[PDB]
Structure 1
Amino acid sequence: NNKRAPYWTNTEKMEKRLHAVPAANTVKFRCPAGGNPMPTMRWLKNGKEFKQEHRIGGYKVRNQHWSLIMESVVPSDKGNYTCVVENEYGSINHTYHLDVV
């Protein structure tokens, strides 16, 4: 049980690309990837990176992987979300198109 690349379970193309981001609200980030118990993922929004250790208003993640919720009241202006999940066997990148409402 170490770090092993997680295979995407749910298509992000059908639940992450075209989405609706409510201004002054928390952003729902989905990146389901079944794999080992050590999944590493980077968060990039419109060319901006945000560490889980620090988030606008707070940071919450389910267990460790699958779903991740971040609070974006100001950054919401940027409706570009790209999920890059890295592992000990490689790094993957995913782009999503959110719209500011």
Structure 2
Amino acid sequence: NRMPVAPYWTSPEKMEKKLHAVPAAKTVKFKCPSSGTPNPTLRWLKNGKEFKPDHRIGGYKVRYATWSIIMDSVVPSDKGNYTCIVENEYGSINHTYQLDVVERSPHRPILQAGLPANKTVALGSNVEFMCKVYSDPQPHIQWLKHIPYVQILKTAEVLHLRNVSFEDAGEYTCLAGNSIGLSHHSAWLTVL
């Protein structure tokens, strides 16, 4: 009916941002604004293969008017390349977006249970206490000796006591804290 026109980008700019990194649970939308006559088709692929809505929990909508696909609540399994393919009887163009998802953990730091563990050593023995911390936001770790009164020992995984003596005996604590809260585990050092 009208003058043929191969499909072309209507907002190439917006498409410059290739990688979409999103925190888990956010709704992700991809657009490939396009035009062409006769009016072109919109299809979407995930890592090369066809992408049907049953391919993921939640499925996904495609607003043909806004040349976009909308995926609610993205999760790691969703990570991958998404390609839109626009085409008509006179041409086909395409574009690919990378999608990365990161699960955010807004809790105070978590210490590995059991660590540090009690220890019994002989006078003169060197000693090491371990502490395993997990924290999305940057954790600040400190080791504390009990004298509850305390004596900061080290300030930012292991507390190292050189040529230990009886005075070295006692309770020790590994403290880790972030913007949300702080956590700690203690252990007792016995000396013989």
**TM bracket, shorter-chain basis:** 0.5 to 0.7
- 2:65 maps to 1:61: no
Following the alignment from structure 2 to structure 1, what is the Cα–Cα distance between the partners of residues 39 and 30?
19
Other-structure match for 1:47? 48
- Poorly superposed stretches of 4+, deviation over 4 Å: 1-4
Native 8 Å contact 1:79 1:100 kept in 2: no
One-letter amino acid of the counterpart of residue 26, structure 1: T
SS of structure 2 residue aligned to 1:64: helix
Following the alignment from structure 2 to structure 1, what is the Cα–Cα distance between the partners of residues 34 and 82?
17
Instruction: State the shift of 1:43 in Å.
Output: 0.7
Gaps of 5+ in 2: 103-192
Instruction: State the shift of 1:85 in Å.
Output: 1.3
Higher Cα radius of gyration: 2
Following the alignment from structure 1 to structure 2, what is the Cα–Cα distance between the partners of residues 95 and 22?
20
Change (3 A) 1:86 1:65: farther
Q: How many residues align?
A: 97
Instruction: State the shift of 1:40 in Å.
Output: 0.8
Change (3 A) 1:22 1:88: farther
One-letter amino acid of the counterpart of residue 8, structure 1: W
Q: What is the TM-score when the length of structure 2 is the normalising length?
A: 0.40
Q: Which moved more, 1:89-98 or 1:55-64?
A: 55-64
Native 8 Å contact 1:21 1:79 kept in 2: no
RMSD: 2.9
Which structure 2 residues correspond to residues 21-40 of structure 1 after superposition, within 5 A? 21-36=22-37, 38-40=39-41
Change (3 A) 1:40 1:65: farther
Following the alignment from structure 2 to structure 1, what is the Cα–Cα distance between the partners of residues 27 and 86?
21
Instruction: State the shift of 1:26 in Å.
Output: 2.8
Native 8 Å contact 1:9 1:32 kept in 2: yes
Instruction: State the shift of 1:23 in Å.
Output: 2.3
After superposition, the C-alpha distances for 1:19-60 in whole angstroms (9 at most, x for unaligned) are 123323332111011224632122112234224xx3542433
Following the alignment from structure 2 to structure 1, what is the Cα–Cα distance between the partners of residues 60 and 96?
21
Gaps of 5+ in 1: none
Native 8 Å contact 1:4 1:88 kept in 2: no
Change (3 A) 1:26 1:4: farther
One-letter amino acid of the counterpart of residue 50, structure 2: E
Give % identity: 70
